[PDB]
């Protein structure tokens, strides 16, 4: 083999390594921002504070990297 050792690519499992790094959820992939440093994914609405839309800038850095 799987791409992710932690969930073994099971779409019915939550996974904070290959899905939302905060909640593990796979839903709303168009709202999961990819960090341009660590490449973890983050639901805009799991961030604290939450972002109300997908940012327009080219790059974005998660709370663990900025």
């Amino acid at each position: 083999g799987p791409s992710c050792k932690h969930c073994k690519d099971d779409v019915n499992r939550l996974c904070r390594v290959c899905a939302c790094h905060l909640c593990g959820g796979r839903q709303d992939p168009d709202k999961q921002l990819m960090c341009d440093e660590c490449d973890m994914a983050f639901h805009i609405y799991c961030l604290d504070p939450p972002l109300s839309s997908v940012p327009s800038e080219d790059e974005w850095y998660c709370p663990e990297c900025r």
Binding site: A19, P29, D30, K31, Q32, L33, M34, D36, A41, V54, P55, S56, E57, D58, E59, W60
Partner: peptide, 6 residues
């Protein structure tokens, strides 16, 4: 920004 959908 890149999203998981990309």
């Amino acid at each position: 920004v890149r999203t998981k959908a990309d």
